[PDB]
Amino acid sequence: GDLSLLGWNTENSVSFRTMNEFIKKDNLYPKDFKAVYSYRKMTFTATGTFDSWEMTTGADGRNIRFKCPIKYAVYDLDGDVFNSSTENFLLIQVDLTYFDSKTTINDPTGENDGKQFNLKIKTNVLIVTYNLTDTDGSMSSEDKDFLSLAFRNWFNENIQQFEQIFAYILLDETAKIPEYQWLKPTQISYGSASVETANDEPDLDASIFSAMSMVENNTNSTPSHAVDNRMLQLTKTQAAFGISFPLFIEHFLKQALLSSQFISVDDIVADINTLTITNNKQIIFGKVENSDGKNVDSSLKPGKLKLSLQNNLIVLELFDLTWEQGRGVTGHFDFRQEYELALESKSGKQIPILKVHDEPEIEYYVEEAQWKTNEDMIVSAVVGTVFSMILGASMKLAGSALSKAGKLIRSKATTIKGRKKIYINRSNVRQLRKDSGATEIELERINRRNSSIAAEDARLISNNGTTSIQTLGDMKKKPMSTGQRIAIGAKKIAGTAVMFGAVGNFGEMLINYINAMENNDYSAIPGINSFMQQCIGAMQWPDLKVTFGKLQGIYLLGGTL
Amino acid sequence: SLNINEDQKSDGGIYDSNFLLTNDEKDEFLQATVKILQRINNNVIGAKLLSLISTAIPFPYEYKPGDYRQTNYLVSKDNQHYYTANLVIFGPGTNIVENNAVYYKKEDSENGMGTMSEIWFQPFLTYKYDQFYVDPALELIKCLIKSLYYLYGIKPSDDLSIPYRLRSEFNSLEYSELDMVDFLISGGTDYKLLNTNPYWFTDNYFINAPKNFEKYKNDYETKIKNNNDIANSIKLYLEQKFKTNVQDIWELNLSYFSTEFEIMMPEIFNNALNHYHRKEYYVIDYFKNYNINGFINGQIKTILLLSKYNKNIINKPELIVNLINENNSVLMKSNIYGDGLKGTIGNFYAVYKIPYNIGDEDSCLDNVDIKEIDNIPPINDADIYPYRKNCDPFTPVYNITETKEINTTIPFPVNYLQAQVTNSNDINL
């Protein structure tokens, strides 16, 4: 249904035309050929010069198909001399293996301590379909078959003359930036997938030749070379990079959730199956200053602070955030937020930016008795708690807007399973944002303050991405609204996305990215190029600008050479 | 091609592009052909004919002095296996009632070397002549004898053809003349008007053919028989082929096999039947209406189901006779059909020159030894060196009949014959 890597993590894909141009520039293919076949007292010869080879449609998985046109050839069929036409060609079938070779490539983004593997044809070559005709149409089908046998004998004998190197890979090379070892392949592979056109012609553009590779010593016991054909067709780019969602989650979402100070290093459990990062035990979300003036611990149940990928969106969820609000009243709130990693063209540069997408979803559950007995009184404290989550701060507001929102709040009350439930959809969130009365400038000021305090938290954050419980208590003991805590957590999570934004304690580099996202200073930040460098330092084509980036089952980037 | 244009259809021929298509039909054809082969082989003379065809390999072509390459071979799909075959029996071509035999190479089958033969055979259909059904085994025998003519390289020049009939239907002088092989092997009463002692009709072909046979016999016995470059199987096959001369092949005809096999066949103008006998076809079930002894319960007492193809018989007549009255009103119309024989406008009898000076001097296949031929081991795939240009490019030949009209004030016999048939079931004679 979508793009699948069938056990692999990283992938680099190109079109057939791009590889054909690589072969054309490299010019490491045989030109002159002399095929000879001798059998049953009969001798057949095909001596001539080949044209430039073209890798066309017909290759799938391990199979690699190349079109070899013939510039001019002479055929000797037991003395029968024939001159081939200029339209004659053959379709050879070969396979690719990453043979180890002496190091010749350089990786400025790596330590160059790995081993160079070059893609070459294994030691054989079979021809699938050919076209061999003379200038007068006097050839016979058996003559053409015999010449095809001679060509097969030539290609098996003369495969060594094709000294073309298909690709270069650095294996087990330590990255120059230690934090991004996930961008250095460990176990590599290739794949092919060719797609025909409507007019039944080889599509040198839509066809996709890929190279899959595991990273960070991930064991793959099922080496497969099948490649999804729609990986390039959607992008319409000459080259593409692909990073698996499992690596996007087990090495990025863990940092975002742990750095949010809501969980500790020993209270986070990775879960590949559900593609969600959460807390194994009950945690604390922050300090709550209700309308009663008493500081309350915001306790989250295990498995509720969720961070996952849904609907091509980074989804952050909170559930079962329960405490004692006052006079023996308990209510539960649920929140869901959607974010999208898009690409923005700023100052002539492609900058990956995480931006809000659609509107959040809210749920609130309470007992019937509280509604029937103390509906009016507890509503004040509930409002004081809720307004923080919306405005990002716990500030009072006029009662006219309170009644205007309260009529809608009481309108959306339903009775399910003996409990009062209210649901807030996408439209109600934007309605609340418009009716809140807080200008976007004030929100930007809040964002600046939260960015500065998130830089302070990252200073408190150790190398592993966690913070000591003593320092966590020192930071959290300060009285601050729960909405501001949500904003600080969001700021820290977004700042942790620099690893997918920029490649290269990490606290000061995060502070540099914070300066870039708060003052628009990317003078020392190359932007996406560094990340693209990590995708091309280890995967060097025989030589680009990246203009496409998205996620369709896989973090996918598209670029043109 | 299984489908041809309508005007390219041969008159009196049945065209069904879906015939012999499914695997069940192909298995039926295979079993029927094998059953007819067993029937022919069971008789002594048929067995001798089969052994002769099995041993009459075409003469190897000397590509180099002392280096001979076979002409009779079949190439596998991927061209690594070669099969020795003197004769391969196919199904019919475009027309499913046209039994025939064709040569692999023209010149090699004309000058004594010999070629492979390819047979178009229709074992499922037969026609009722007078009071009997023609045995398909006899048609297979006739095609086998034509294949013998091809294998021994004694095929005449295409222009050699004795006259057969006078086209008396037309108002013009024209003679329908039959090919030499067809006249030599058809038999019948017509063959009695040429096989005379002395021979009134002689041609250079009957002198040249034994010459070429003896020439290649000498070539074998001097060059080949003492040569170890080729397998002894080819030596034995050529020894058995040359053990029978061309006179024996000439005297083989359907009259002799009709006498030996006791098969009723047409005997008068039997190669010009398409003008006389507008055939009707019957389907033969070789598990029900045939066995090793021909038609079960005789050729007359057996019952055959009418074939579905009789309505599909193409009827393009050579003449349309229109009986008209004084006021030129079209009273009656009828079709007179051709015979598929080349019609010349010149009198053959007024041009032929009876040879004043000539020399005139047993069982037809007495010299053939079935036991000797059977004892020969076959030719393995590993000892076959083919010759590339052993096959002429096959070209289908389409006979284009011509249609002409005649207006008659006096009824012709076909007018009466067609007026005597009716489809109405309430008939007043």
XYZ file of C-alpha atoms in Angstrom, chain A residues 39-42 44 77-80 140 142-143 145-146 149, chain B residues 63 69 75 77-80 82 229 381 384-386 388-389:
30
model
C 30.377 -26.314 -33.019
C 29.392 -29.266 -35.214
C 32.054 -28.396 -37.812
C 30.427 -24.957 -38.179
C 30.175 -18.314 -36.743
C 28.260 -17.774 -40.957
C 30.542 -20.500 -42.326
C 31.686 -18.068 -45.000
C 28.382 -16.194 -45.341
C 17.117 -16.274 -41.028
C 18.291 -19.804 -37.086
C 21.125 -17.531 -38.245
C 19.844 -17.632 -32.982
C 23.354 -18.867 -33.810
C 24.755 -17.981 -29.060
C 30.833 -29.555 -48.063
C 26.950 -33.039 -43.930
C 16.629 -28.556 -35.081
C 14.069 -25.287 -29.819
C 17.365 -23.982 -28.437
C 19.390 -25.546 -31.290
C 21.561 -28.060 -29.438
C 19.482 -32.512 -33.976
C 34.295 -39.555 -41.283
C 22.136 -36.783 -31.750
C 24.899 -35.277 -36.759
C 26.614 -32.452 -38.648
C 23.977 -30.435 -40.521
C 22.804 -24.944 -43.391
C 21.169 -24.460 -46.800
